[PDB]
RNA sequence: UAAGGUGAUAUGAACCGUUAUAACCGGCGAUUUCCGAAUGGGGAAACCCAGUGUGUUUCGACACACUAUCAUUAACUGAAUCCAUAGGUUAAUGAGGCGAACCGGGGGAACUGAAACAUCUAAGUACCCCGAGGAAAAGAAAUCAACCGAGAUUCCCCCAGUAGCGGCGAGCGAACGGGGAGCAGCCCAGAGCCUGAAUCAGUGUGUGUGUUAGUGGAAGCGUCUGGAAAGGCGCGCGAUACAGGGUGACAGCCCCGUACACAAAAAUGCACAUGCUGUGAGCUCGAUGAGUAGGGCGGGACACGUGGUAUCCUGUCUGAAUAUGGGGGGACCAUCCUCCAAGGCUAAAUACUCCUGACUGACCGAUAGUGAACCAGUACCGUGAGGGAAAGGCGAAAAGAACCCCGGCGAGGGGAGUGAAAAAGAACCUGAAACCGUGUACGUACAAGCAGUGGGAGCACAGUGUGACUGCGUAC
């Protein structure tokens, strides 16, 4: 399902509002891509369907620090 | 704790035999009590080919209510009520009005 | 001697009231010309 | 002529049978609604 | 309060208020109180104590 | 705890027990087929087919046990590939399923209202899903207030149908402040001295107290009617008990109870006392939660529909300061008040009732009250989801009609009998009306129509019934 593996961004729902304010239901899907991140600890590549907000969490916090927050959470990678 | 038991010479307080004295034959389940020679009815007993093929108008005794009898005291001469005391670790039926054990 | 049976109605109409009333499917009366 | 009900136990038990009802979420809700009603026969089965 | 003041005013009119100074009974026994109002000449009564 | 029992329709039959295990009631224990999460694989539930152990074997076999998947962890051995992973196996743990409502979260209508309708409404409702607990959630100020101050959340009453929002329409609708219910605050981002230092848990004896069987209970007789007395009349007695029920009619005193006084092998709820184990105090200091706050865009939530509009949430794109700093105070700014976000836990007041116990009712009384007073979610109906009835009363007690007649060894009936009553006979209390008969009185076979009404003979009864002829007269 369209969930970021680092930030946990679900698709959220909301409205389309026209210029005549007609509300109709839509979904704000997260900007998800599967990307392979190089870890020098594990000496491998690891792929993660991550949002583009999550790609910024990874290089700001570290890729070891992000994965440590996934094994201690319950995600599988 | 029954106040009216298997073989007690009782007296009837109510209902067409008011005053008559007989002995209990068997206490049934539903508060009905057979008294000997007291509550006589007239059963038109149908003869079946076996099993008491005498099929007369059999006169048996019907069940009377257990509250309509009282135990005959006979040491006062009157009907009398029952209480329950403990003598010698046994629950003891005793008469009212003279407190003495049955 | 197991007598005084009832009047078992049809198992079609669940409102025994109209069980013997109308079939309750199609009402075909066809000759109506009003213009 | 040919009426709508042509019985077959195999087509019955594969459509409305207990294992067919217990296969999906919406059939276990059927069986939940028929225990909650108090139904004698739960499915078409026996 | 205007009703109760008007009922108590009427109970002294139809002489159904009797004020005692003490109404007490020694043993907590219904037999004694059953006697309590025979001398008082009461059968249907409401006792109101403080 | 007992003198009676072997559940009910349900009689028997064969028995068991009688003051010490007959049954009954309770606590604990054993047994607990098959299906169903169903778990050894399968399957059209209630069936089919095994695997591997372990026995035992008359050699035909027979038993008992194991064998699900997933999650976490550990052990071993293990590719492409050398390390190493992935994988594979074997263990231990734990999970799943069902459940009426309440609860939190994720999704989310339309009819309707607007007198049409699209913004708005209905309504974040119905529903669907996920998850939890006895409650849940929220919760210890980035809060309000207004220059005074308040001091976590929740709930209730006001504030107030106010301020506002709003095709400024329909409608929506607060806070501040005040009165109450209940009221506890604490941790981690951290190292020292001290060093079980109270805590808060679990487990176990111990006490106090319920729950789960129970025990004792207090007293009335004559008399008349009657089928029968509980009624009437007479005269007593109990009452911390005159709540209720039953008994042949209406019982304080007949029974069961009730008030009251009591009781527990054993297993449990609650407190307390705690011993023993786990967490872990107090003091010195530092530390003070970043892809966050904020912003641009799009939405949503706030009573608040983007409007001048704060605040919150965040899909997307960005991006601080780091206490000498930061948030808020309804656009925004300056003052100066107040607070310290980006970690978490937290009882009570609150909501609910599938279920158990009592208790109550200006609640129902069999077309009512549950759909269901009764073998009712049944009979029936539908492929199915699903729908879904009707049906209570003999009598005080079966004493439920022996026997005799007619009949077809019928059905039904007439006697006889029971009983107060059979016009209580089971198609059974009471038995209305429609509707259908029989008997009797009167009328009626030359008379036209809302059928009555006014007049009215005659006749039949003991005033009633009928009503010839006649005037007027087209139901609701």
Write the secondary structure of A18-73 as one string of H (helix), E (strand) and C (coil). Answer: CCCCCEEEEEECCCEEEEEEEECCCCEEEEEEEEHHHHHHHHHHCHHHHHHHHHCC
Tell me the three-class secondary structure of chain B, residue by residue.
Answer: CCCCCCCCEEEECCCCCCCCEEEEEEECCCCEEEECCCCEEEEECCCCCCCCCCCCEEEEECEEEHHHEEEECCCCCCEECEEEEEECCEEEEEECCCCCEC
Q: How far is it, in rounded angstroms, from Cα A29 to Cα A10?
A: 7
How far is Cα of residue B30 from the mean position of the Cα atoms in its chain?
14
Query: What is the C-alpha radius of gyration for chain C, rounded to an integer number of angstroms?
Result: 18
> Look-up: residue for tokens 């008011």?
B18
* Pair of tokens at residue C28: 């075909």
Count of Cβ atoms closer than 10 Å to residue B17 Cβ? 19
The set of strand F positions with any atom below 7 Å of a protein CB reads: 1-6, 17-19, 36-37, 43-46, 72, 83, 85, 97-100, 106-109, 118-120, 129-130, 215-217, 219-221, 227-230, 238-241, 246-248, 251, 254-257, 290-292, 298-300, 306, 314-319, 371, 376-389, 396-403, 411-412, 417-420, 427
First to last CA, chain C: 66
Give the phi and the psi of residue B34 in degrees, each rounded to 5.
-85, 125
What residues contact residue B50 under an 8 Å CB cut-off, 6+ apart? none
Q: Answer whether B95's CB lies under 8 Å from B73's CB.
A: yes
What residues contact residue A31 under an 8 Å CB cut-off, 6+ apart? A51, A52, A53
The closest of A49, A58, A43 to A29, measured between CA atoms, is A49
What residues contact residue B92 under an 8 Å CB cut-off, 6+ apart? B84, B85, B86, B101, B102
How far is Cα of residue A25 from the mean position of the Cα atoms in its chain?
23
Compute, in degrees rounded to 10, the torsion defined by CA atoms D36, D41, D45, D46: 150
Handedness of CA E28, E34, E40, E45 (dihedral sign): positive
Structure determination method: cryo-EM
CA distances from A64 to A34, A37, A77 (A): 17, 10, 12
Angle at B39 between CA B33 and CA B45, to 5 degrees: 100
- Residue C4 CA distance to nucleotide F428 C1' (Å): 14
Q: Answer whether A68's CB lies under 8 Å from A47's CB.
A: no
Domains: count for chain A: 1
Chains with ≥3 Cβ pairs under 8 A against C?
Answer: none
> Look-up: residue for tokens 């190089």?
A38
- Burial of residue A4 (number of CB atoms within 10 Å: 0-12, 13-18, 19+): buried
Chains with ≥3 Cβ pairs under 8 A against A?
Answer: none
Domains: count for chain D: 1
Compute, in degrees rounded to 10, the torsion defined by CA atoms B25, B13, B80, B86: 50
| Structural domain that includes position D20 | 1-46
């Amino acid at each position: 399902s369209r969930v970021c593996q680092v930030t946990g961004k679900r698709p959220v729902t909301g409205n389309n509002r026209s210029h005549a304010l007609n509300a109709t239901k839509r979904r704000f899907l997260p900007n998800l891509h599967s990307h392979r991140f190089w870890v020098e600890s594990e000496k491998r590549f690891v792929t993660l369907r991550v949002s583009a907000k999550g790609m910024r969490v990874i290089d700001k916090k570290g890729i070891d620090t992000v994965l440590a927050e996934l094994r201690a959470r319950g995600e599988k990678y | 704790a029954a106040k009216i038991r298997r073989d007690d010479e009782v007296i009837v307080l109510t209902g067409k035999d008011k005053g008559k004295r007989g002995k209990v034959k068997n206490v049934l389940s539903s508060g009905k009590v057979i008294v000997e020679g007291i509550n006589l009815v007239k059963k038109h007993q149908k003869p079946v080919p076996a099993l008491n093929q005498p099929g007369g108008i059999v006169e048996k005794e019907a069940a009377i209510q257990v509250s309509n009898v009282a135990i005959f005291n006979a040491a006062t001469g009157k009907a009398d009520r029952v209480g329950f005391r403990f003598e010698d670790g046994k629950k003891v039926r005793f008469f009212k009005s003279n407190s003495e054990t049955i | 001697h197991c007598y005084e049976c009832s009047s078992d109605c049809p198992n079609l109409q669940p409102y025994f009231s109209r069980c013997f009333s109308t079939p309750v499917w199609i009402s075909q009366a066809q000759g109506i010309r009003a213009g | 002529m040919k009426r709508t009900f042509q019985p077959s136990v195999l087509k019955r038990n594969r459509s409305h049978g207990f294992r067919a009802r217990m296969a999906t979420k919406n059939g276990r809700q059927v069986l939940a609604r028929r225990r909650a009603k108090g139904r004698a026969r739960l499915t078409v089965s026996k | 309060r205007g009703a109760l003041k008007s009922i108590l005013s009427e109970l002294v009119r139809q002489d159904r208020l009797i004020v005692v100074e003490k109404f007490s009974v020694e043993a907590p026994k219904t037999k004694l109180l059953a006697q309590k109002l025979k001398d008082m000449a009461l059968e249907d009564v409401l006792i109101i104590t403080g």
